[PDB]
From a paper:
Three enzyme activities in the protozoan Leishmania major, namely N5,N10-methylenetetrahydrofolate dehydrogenase/N5,N10-methenyltetrahydrofolate cyclohydrolase (DHCH) and N10-formyltetrahydrofolate ligase (FTL) produce the essential intermediate N10-formyltetrahydrofolate. The cytosolic DHCH activity appears essential in L. major since knockouts of the disomic copies were not possible without ectopic expression of FTL to provide an alternative route to N10-formyltetrahydrofolate.
The crystal structure of LmDHCH has been determined at 2.7 Å resolution. The asymmetric unit is a homodimer and subunits are labeled A and B. The first and last few residues (1–2 and 1–3, 297–298 in chains A and B, respectively) are disordered and an additional three residues are disordered in chain B (248–250). This high value reflects differences in domain positions, which will be discussed, and in a loop adjacent to the active site (residues 240–255; RMSD 4.1 Å over 13 Cα). The polypeptide folds into N- and C-terminal domains comprising residues 5–147 and 148–298, respectively. A cleft is formed between the two domains and at one end an NADP+ binding site, typical of a Rossmann fold (βαβαβ), is formed. The substrate-binding site is at the other end of the cleft. Analysis of the domains of LmDHCH from the crystallographically independent chains shows a significant pivot around a hinge (residues 150–152 and 274–280) with a rotation of almost 14° evident.
Author numbering:
A (entry chain B): 4 to 245, 249 to 296
B (entry chain A): 3 to 298
Amino acid sequence: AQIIDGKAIAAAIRSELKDKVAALRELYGGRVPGLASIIVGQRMDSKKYVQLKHKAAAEVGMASFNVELPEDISQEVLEVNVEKLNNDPNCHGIIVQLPLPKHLNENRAIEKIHPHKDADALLPVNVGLLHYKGREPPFTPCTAKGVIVLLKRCGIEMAGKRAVVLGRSNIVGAPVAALLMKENATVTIVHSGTSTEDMIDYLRTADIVIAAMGQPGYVKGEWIKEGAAVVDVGTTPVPDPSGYRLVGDVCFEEAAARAAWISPVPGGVGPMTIAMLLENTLEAFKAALG
Amino acid sequence: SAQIIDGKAIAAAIRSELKDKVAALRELYGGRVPGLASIIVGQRMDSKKYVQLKHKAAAEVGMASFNVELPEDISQEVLEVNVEKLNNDPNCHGIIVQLPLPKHLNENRAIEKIHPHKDADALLPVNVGLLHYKGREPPFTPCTAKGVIVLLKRCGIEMAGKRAVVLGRSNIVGAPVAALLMKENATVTIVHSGTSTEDMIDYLRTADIVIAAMGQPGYVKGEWIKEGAAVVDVGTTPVPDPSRKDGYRLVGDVCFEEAAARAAWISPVPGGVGPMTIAMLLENTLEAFKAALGVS
Ligand SMILES: [Cl-]
């Protein structure tokens, strides 16, 4: 199996964005793209991703606006802070770090984000534009965009191929399936309603497999078609060593013995999703002054 | 042999149910009633006929009807103004623009003017988004798409835990119905122009449900259908075979008589969708009126 090096590929894209952003700074005053990120409650998991997200933003020479709010916050306040970032012309990309507190309604908060700034592509209007044939959205969900880029960059054919997507999530599973189809892959989406032996039968002939269920060590190598490509989007924290570890959905050592390609975890689609968020933001800024 | 999914009858039953529901809401809410509004531009006899049929169905159920007929050579701006008038008309709950418009007008732009909550055909991206958004329900589902799922539910055809193949990925039927089946927990594969014939056949071999939406007359062979499967033929294409007035008959994607020997359930063309689509347009419009009042 060929290790799909997302860390390397993303490193290449990050530099391409830095040099692109540098050029635009010369052409348009002291202006640079802005990446905002609201966080409700001091959640340990989400705090880490935010630190990594603004690091790459700083590494590519973008502005970062990290809003943090406490746990016991009313919806009105959360929606005011989003509208603040909407009216801020120095902020071009807005994301709300899920998962929010149970008492807060995520849907109605995300709805407040302007369509031209919805950098994570979570607004229904952006989800629709994606799925609608003959219409292309302002943004694509980062993880799904990344998976396709790793597919193209590695020279992996999607036209006329059989594709199984494990998971139907709004962030990864659904959008990747829609995009794989847009590349003339014949896609089947597996999920909790699917029986295990159905899953395995779909996997039996799958040329491309996307593990986006988010359950560590679920996909075994025996299911993967010999000569297929497997993208492990799963990235759940396990507390085994030292003080945490990032294990994915695919049983790597099993799947590597059969698949022609395999994305590892860590160092797979994780750095891609960050790169795509920046590229989205960069494209967001380029739209504002195109 | 396979049993015949009588879509015509099912739709008839639904129109009766809507009629009663609309009559029940009248008593409770001051004699108020749902309004289905349409906009047609120019004078195409195809578009005029379609619009009559929808408005007649709306009359049978006791809904109000709003037909706006604009000239063929009218401005985009002026069309959109009339669309905005309907948006701000509380007597009107559903709004459809009859397609295709004249070439000089922009359709997607005229449709974008419609308020998301009055988009009876579910043509707006935001409604398409909500339809695909796992964990949210759209105010409207695409009519033909929704009526295919209701055909199944009403025949007692299980979707959850089943394998399904949607032949075709068209915006108007294929794509939406594929997501509705997944939402119903069927495991769905969408076959399309990029799909190999051998794979298409392989997928169909295990398909408990099959939705024929490619638009190719008589191409799904009966032997490809899994023994006991449910087949919904949504494709419709005229052919010059039959000695008849007009010299044609509508023929579906599926070879019916072949599919009947293997399938448990099937919907023939004619009998596939048709009055279901219009029925689903009325149900969509009821939900809008039900929503606009505050009733769940
Ligand atoms: Cl699921």
